[PDB]
mmCIF file with all atom_site columns, C-alpha atoms in Angstrom:
data_model
loop_
_atom_site.group_PDB
_atom_site.id
_atom_site.type_symbol
_atom_site.label_atom_id
_atom_site.label_alt_id
_atom_site.label_comp_id
_atom_site.label_asym_id
_atom_site.label_entity_id
_atom_site.label_seq_id
_atom_site.pdbx_PDB_ins_code
_atom_site.Cartn_x
_atom_site.Cartn_y
_atom_site.Cartn_z
_atom_site.occupancy
_atom_site.B_iso_or_equiv
_atom_site.pdbx_formal_charge
_atom_site.auth_seq_id
_atom_site.auth_comp_id
_atom_site.auth_asym_id
_atom_site.auth_atom_id
_atom_site.pdbx_PDB_model_num
ATOM 1   C CA . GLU A 1 1   ? 100.907 100.002 80.364  1.00 14.24 ? 1023 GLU A CA 1
ATOM 2   C CA . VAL A 1 2   ? 101.991 98.129  83.488  1.00 8.75  ? 1024 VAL A CA 1
ATOM 3   C CA . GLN A 1 3   ? 105.687 98.907  84.009  1.00 9.27  ? 1025 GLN A CA 1
ATOM 4   C CA . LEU A 1 4   ? 108.244 98.304  86.757  1.00 9.54  ? 1026 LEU A CA 1
ATOM 5   C CA . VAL A 1 5   ? 111.357 100.447 86.287  1.00 8.28  ? 1027 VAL A CA 1
ATOM 6   C CA . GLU A 1 6   ? 114.266 99.732  88.611  1.00 8.52  ? 1028 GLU A CA 1
ATOM 7   C CA . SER A 1 7   ? 117.170 101.896 89.725  1.00 9.37  ? 1029 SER A CA 1
ATOM 8   C CA . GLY A 1 8   ? 119.773 102.150 92.477  1.00 10.97 ? 1030 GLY A CA 1
ATOM 9   C CA . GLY A 1 9   ? 122.264 99.336  91.928  1.00 10.21 ? 1031 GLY A CA 1
ATOM 10  C CA . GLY A 1 10  ? 126.009 99.591  91.774  1.00 8.35  ? 1032 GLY A CA 1
ATOM 11  C CA . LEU A 1 11  ? 129.377 98.370  93.000  1.00 8.84  ? 1033 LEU A CA 1
ATOM 12  C CA . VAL A 1 12  ? 130.295 98.944  96.659  1.00 10.34 ? 1034 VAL A CA 1
ATOM 13  C CA . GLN A 1 13  ? 132.550 97.554  99.382  1.00 8.72  ? 1035 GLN A CA 1
ATOM 14  C CA . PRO A 1 14  ? 131.486 94.948  101.966 1.00 8.46  ? 1036 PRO A CA 1
ATOM 15  C CA . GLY A 1 15  ? 129.571 96.437  104.869 1.00 7.23  ? 1037 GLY A CA 1
ATOM 16  C CA . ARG A 1 16  ? 128.170 99.312  102.841 1.00 5.08  ? 1038 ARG A CA 1
ATOM 17  C CA . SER A 1 17  ? 124.581 99.825  101.745 1.00 10.52 ? 1039 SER A CA 1
ATOM 18  C CA . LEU A 1 18  ? 122.438 100.382 98.666  1.00 14.42 ? 1040 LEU A CA 1
ATOM 19  C CA . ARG A 1 19  ? 118.772 101.159 98.107  1.00 12.18 ? 1041 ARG A CA 1
ATOM 20  C CA . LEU A 1 20  ? 117.089 99.640  95.086  1.00 13.42 ? 1042 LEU A CA 1
ATOM 21  C CA . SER A 1 21  ? 114.005 101.437 93.737  1.00 12.96 ? 1043 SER A CA 1
ATOM 22  C CA . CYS A 1 22  ? 111.114 99.990  91.738  1.00 12.58 ? 1044 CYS A CA 1
ATOM 23  C CA . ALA A 1 23  ? 108.956 102.709 90.154  1.00 12.11 ? 1045 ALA A CA 1
ATOM 24  C CA . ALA A 1 24  ? 105.534 101.299 89.276  1.00 7.64  ? 1046 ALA A CA 1
ATOM 25  C CA . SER A 1 25  ? 103.328 102.469 86.401  1.00 8.49  ? 1047 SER A CA 1
ATOM 26  C CA . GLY A 1 26  ? 99.829  101.417 85.407  1.00 7.52  ? 1048 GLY A CA 1
ATOM 27  C CA . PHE A 1 27  ? 98.566  100.248 88.813  1.00 8.83  ? 1049 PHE A CA 1
ATOM 28  C CA . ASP A 1 28  ? 98.263  101.446 92.401  1.00 9.67  ? 1050 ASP A CA 1
ATOM 29  C CA . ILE A 1 29  ? 101.154 99.960  94.363  1.00 7.70  ? 1051 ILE A CA 1
ATOM 30  C CA . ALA A 1 30  ? 99.191  100.035 97.635  1.00 7.32  ? 1052 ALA A CA 1
ATOM 31  C CA . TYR A 1 31  ? 96.960  97.214  96.302  1.00 4.45  ? 1053 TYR A CA 1
ATOM 32  C CA . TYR A 1 32  ? 99.611  94.889  94.832  1.00 5.14  ? 1054 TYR A CA 1
ATOM 33  C CA . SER A 1 33  ? 102.277 92.636  96.269  1.00 6.01  ? 1055 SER A CA 1
ATOM 34  C CA . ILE A 1 34  ? 105.829 93.617  95.259  1.00 2.84  ? 1056 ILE A CA 1
ATOM 35  C CA . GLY A 1 35  ? 108.941 91.506  95.740  1.00 6.75  ? 1057 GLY A CA 1
ATOM 36  C CA . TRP A 1 36  ? 112.583 91.172  94.760  1.00 4.66  ? 1058 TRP A CA 1
ATOM 37  C CA . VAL A 1 37  ? 114.241 88.145  93.122  1.00 3.15  ? 1059 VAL A CA 1
ATOM 38  C CA . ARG A 1 38  ? 117.965 87.687  92.477  1.00 5.49  ? 1060 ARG A CA 1
ATOM 39  C CA . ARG A 1 39  ? 120.136 85.480  90.254  1.00 4.40  ? 1061 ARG A CA 1
ATOM 40  C CA . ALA A 1 40  ? 123.874 85.049  89.672  1.00 5.74  ? 1062 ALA A CA 1
ATOM 41  C CA . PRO A 1 41  ? 126.267 82.772  87.729  1.00 4.28  ? 1063 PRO A CA 1
ATOM 42  C CA . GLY A 1 42  ? 126.909 79.437  89.401  1.00 7.16  ? 1064 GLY A CA 1
ATOM 43  C CA . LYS A 1 43  ? 124.035 80.032  91.825  1.00 8.50  ? 1065 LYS A CA 1
ATOM 44  C CA . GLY A 1 44  ? 120.404 79.357  91.458  1.00 10.95 ? 1066 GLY A CA 1
ATOM 45  C CA . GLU A 1 45  ? 117.695 81.966  91.659  1.00 11.52 ? 1067 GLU A CA 1
ATOM 46  C CA . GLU A 1 46  ? 116.035 83.057  94.849  1.00 10.14 ? 1068 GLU A CA 1
ATOM 47  C CA . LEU A 1 47  ? 113.160 85.133  96.191  1.00 8.21  ? 1069 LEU A CA 1
ATOM 48  C CA . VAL A 1 48  ? 114.731 87.793  98.432  1.00 7.58  ? 1070 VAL A CA 1
ATOM 49  C CA . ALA A 1 49  ? 111.900 89.813  99.962  1.00 11.86 ? 1071 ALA A CA 1
ATOM 50  C CA . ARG A 1 50  ? 108.189 90.390  99.510  1.00 13.44 ? 1072 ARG A CA 1
ATOM 51  C CA . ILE A 1 51  ? 105.625 92.899  100.795 1.00 14.21 ? 1073 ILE A CA 1
ATOM 52  C CA . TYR A 1 52  ? 101.920 91.969  101.021 1.00 16.54 ? 1074 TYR A CA 1
ATOM 53  C CA . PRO A 1 53  ? 99.064  94.463  100.562 1.00 18.87 ? 1075 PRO A CA 1
ATOM 54  C CA . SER A 1 54  ? 96.712  92.960  103.198 1.00 21.79 ? 1076 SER A CA 1
ATOM 55  C CA . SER A 1 55  ? 98.652  94.245  106.229 1.00 23.34 ? 1077 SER A CA 1
ATOM 56  C CA . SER A 1 56  ? 101.833 95.646  104.598 1.00 27.25 ? 1078 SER A CA 1
ATOM 57  C CA . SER A 1 57  ? 103.701 92.808  106.293 1.00 28.95 ? 1079 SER A CA 1
ATOM 58  C CA . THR A 1 58  ? 106.961 91.587  104.812 1.00 28.36 ? 1080 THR A CA 1
ATOM 59  C CA . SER A 1 59  ? 108.889 88.338  104.435 1.00 29.80 ? 1081 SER A CA 1
ATOM 60  C CA . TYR A 1 60  ? 112.562 87.709  103.691 1.00 32.05 ? 1082 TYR A CA 1
ATOM 61  C CA . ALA A 1 61  ? 114.959 84.974  102.657 1.00 34.53 ? 1083 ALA A CA 1
ATOM 62  C CA . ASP A 1 62  ? 116.963 83.603  105.594 1.00 35.25 ? 1084 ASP A CA 1
ATOM 63  C CA . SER A 1 63  ? 120.234 84.875  104.131 1.00 35.99 ? 1085 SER A CA 1
ATOM 64  C CA . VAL A 1 64  ? 119.122 88.537  104.078 1.00 33.95 ? 1086 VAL A CA 1
ATOM 65  C CA . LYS A 1 65  ? 116.779 88.894  107.070 1.00 37.10 ? 1087 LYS A CA 1
ATOM 66  C CA . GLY A 1 66  ? 117.810 91.692  109.400 1.00 34.39 ? 1088 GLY A CA 1
ATOM 67  C CA . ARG A 1 67  ? 119.985 93.254  106.674 1.00 37.94 ? 1089 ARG A CA 1
ATOM 68  C CA . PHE A 1 68  ? 117.473 93.906  103.856 1.00 37.96 ? 1090 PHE A CA 1
ATOM 69  C CA . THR A 1 69  ? 114.194 95.799  104.240 1.00 39.31 ? 1091 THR A CA 1
ATOM 70  C CA . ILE A 1 70  ? 111.443 95.995  101.644 1.00 39.18 ? 1092 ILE A CA 1
ATOM 71  C CA . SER A 1 71  ? 108.992 98.891  101.774 1.00 38.13 ? 1093 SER A CA 1
ATOM 72  C CA . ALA A 1 72  ? 106.718 100.979 99.577  1.00 37.87 ? 1094 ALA A CA 1
ATOM 73  C CA . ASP A 1 73  ? 105.921 104.686 99.263  1.00 38.17 ? 1095 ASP A CA 1
ATOM 74  C CA . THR A 1 74  ? 102.328 104.936 98.068  1.00 36.56 ? 1096 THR A CA 1
ATOM 75  C CA . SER A 1 75  ? 102.756 108.670 97.425  1.00 36.23 ? 1097 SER A CA 1
ATOM 76  C CA . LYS A 1 76  ? 105.506 107.909 94.889  1.00 36.85 ? 1098 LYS A CA 1
ATOM 77  C CA . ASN A 1 77  ? 104.056 104.567 93.663  1.00 35.29 ? 1099 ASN A CA 1
ATOM 78  C CA . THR A 1 78  ? 107.518 103.100 94.292  1.00 34.75 ? 1100 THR A CA 1
ATOM 79  C CA . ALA A 1 79  ? 108.858 100.127 96.235  1.00 31.38 ? 1101 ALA A CA 1
ATOM 80  C CA . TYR A 1 80  ? 112.330 99.963  97.766  1.00 32.63 ? 1102 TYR A CA 1
ATOM 81  C CA . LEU A 1 81  ? 114.806 97.319  98.845  1.00 33.61 ? 1103 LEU A CA 1
ATOM 82  C CA . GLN A 1 82  ? 117.135 98.807  101.469 1.00 35.43 ? 1104 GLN A CA 1
ATOM 83  C CA . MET A 1 83  ? 120.263 96.614  101.445 1.00 35.53 ? 1105 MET A CA 1
ATOM 84  C CA . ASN A 1 84  ? 122.390 97.163  104.552 1.00 32.22 ? 1106 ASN A CA 1
ATOM 85  C CA . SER A 1 85  ? 125.577 95.364  105.639 1.00 30.46 ? 1107 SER A CA 1
ATOM 86  C CA . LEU A 1 86  ? 126.244 94.096  102.132 1.00 30.69 ? 1108 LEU A CA 1
ATOM 87  C CA . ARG A 1 87  ? 128.222 90.849  101.791 1.00 31.56 ? 1109 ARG A CA 1
ATOM 88  C CA . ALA A 1 88  ? 130.206 89.391  98.900  1.00 31.12 ? 1110 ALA A CA 1
ATOM 89  C CA . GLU A 1 89  ? 127.593 86.674  98.417  1.00 29.46 ? 1111 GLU A CA 1
ATOM 90  C CA . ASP A 1 90  ? 124.927 89.362  97.756  1.00 27.89 ? 1112 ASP A CA 1
ATOM 91  C CA . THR A 1 91  ? 126.455 90.033  94.303  1.00 26.25 ? 1113 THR A CA 1
ATOM 92  C CA . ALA A 1 92  ? 123.647 89.312  91.820  1.00 27.17 ? 1114 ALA A CA 1
ATOM 93  C CA . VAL A 1 93  ? 121.231 90.771  89.326  1.00 25.38 ? 1115 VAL A CA 1
ATOM 94  C CA . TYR A 1 94  ? 118.125 91.839  91.263  1.00 26.16 ? 1116 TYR A CA 1
ATOM 95  C CA . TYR A 1 95  ? 114.624 92.055  89.759  1.00 26.52 ? 1117 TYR A CA 1
ATOM 96  C CA . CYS A 1 96  ? 111.522 93.799  91.028  1.00 25.39 ? 1118 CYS A CA 1
ATOM 97  C CA . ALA A 1 97  ? 108.366 91.714  90.595  1.00 22.35 ? 1119 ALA A CA 1
ATOM 98  C CA . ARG A 1 98  ? 104.605 92.162  90.932  1.00 22.65 ? 1120 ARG A CA 1
ATOM 99  C CA . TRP A 1 99  ? 102.102 89.441  91.757  1.00 20.82 ? 1121 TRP A CA 1
ATOM 100 C CA . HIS A 1 100 ? 98.715  88.986  90.136  1.00 17.11 ? 1122 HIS A CA 1
ATOM 101 C CA . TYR A 1 101 ? 95.784  90.128  92.279  1.00 15.70 ? 1123 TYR A CA 1
ATOM 102 C CA . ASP A 1 102 ? 94.695  86.494  92.711  1.00 11.06 ? 1124 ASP A CA 1
ATOM 103 C CA . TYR A 1 103 ? 97.929  85.756  94.632  1.00 11.41 ? 1125 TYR A CA 1
ATOM 104 C CA . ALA A 1 104 ? 98.534  89.147  96.272  1.00 12.93 ? 1126 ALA A CA 1
ATOM 105 C CA . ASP A 1 105 ? 98.535  87.701  99.809  1.00 13.60 ? 1127 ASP A CA 1
ATOM 106 C CA . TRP A 1 106 ? 99.468  84.108  98.917  1.00 10.76 ? 1128 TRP A CA 1
ATOM 107 C CA . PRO A 1 107 ? 103.082 83.407  99.966  1.00 11.08 ? 1129 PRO A CA 1
ATOM 108 C CA . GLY A 1 108 ? 105.603 81.980  97.531  1.00 9.82  ? 1130 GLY A CA 1
ATOM 109 C CA . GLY A 1 109 ? 107.006 82.605  94.088  1.00 9.73  ? 1131 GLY A CA 1
ATOM 110 C CA . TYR A 1 110 ? 103.829 81.394  92.391  1.00 6.00  ? 1132 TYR A CA 1
ATOM 111 C CA . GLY A 1 111 ? 101.635 84.116  90.906  1.00 5.04  ? 1133 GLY A CA 1
ATOM 112 C CA . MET A 1 112 ? 104.150 86.706  89.663  1.00 5.89  ? 1134 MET A CA 1
ATOM 113 C CA . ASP A 1 113 ? 102.910 88.565  86.592  1.00 6.20  ? 1135 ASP A CA 1
ATOM 114 C CA . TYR A 1 114 ? 105.334 91.465  85.913  1.00 2.00  ? 1136 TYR A CA 1
ATOM 115 C CA . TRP A 1 115 ? 109.094 91.981  86.303  1.00 2.00  ? 1137 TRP A CA 1
ATOM 116 C CA . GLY A 1 116 ? 111.558 94.850  86.097  1.00 2.00  ? 1138 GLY A CA 1
ATOM 117 C CA . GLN A 1 117 ? 114.582 94.948  83.785  1.00 2.00  ? 1139 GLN A CA 1
ATOM 118 C CA . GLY A 1 118 ? 117.163 93.777  86.325  1.00 2.00  ? 1140 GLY A CA 1
ATOM 119 C CA . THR A 1 119 ? 119.663 95.740  88.409  1.00 2.00  ? 1141 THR A CA 1
ATOM 120 C CA . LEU A 1 120 ? 123.195 94.546  89.080  1.00 2.00  ? 1142 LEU A CA 1
ATOM 121 C CA . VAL A 1 121 ? 124.456 94.849  92.646  1.00 2.00  ? 1143 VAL A CA 1
ATOM 122 C CA . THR A 1 122 ? 128.092 93.946  93.229  1.00 2.00  ? 1144 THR A CA 1
ATOM 123 C CA . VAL A 1 123 ? 130.013 93.755  96.492  1.00 2.00  ? 1145 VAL A CA 1
ATOM 124 C CA . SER A 1 124 ? 133.741 94.025  95.869  1.00 2.00  ? 1146 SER A CA 1
#
């Protein structure tokens, strides 16, 4: 009954922008931490961005700060990753993730409990 359904990926040129969407079902997004993880061949895997329900503050990986913005629309029960100034090294499969309540405001990758299906973003 808990579902995270992603959309918004694609293939674009360097310098352009994309907005990933993560439509949540089965819980109220205003009370849960949402984040984005990415993976790619020959790379590792990395936490990109996270939003915390305590103060709606955000945190970002060093390589994307100032270019990516994570946010949530409580009215639509959806989180977004706004990806501006895309770079070749941003090519990856991106996943939306939810954290368990027990770790909602605890920073790090520990505590995730649901994930989206994966969305490919490619910079040409």
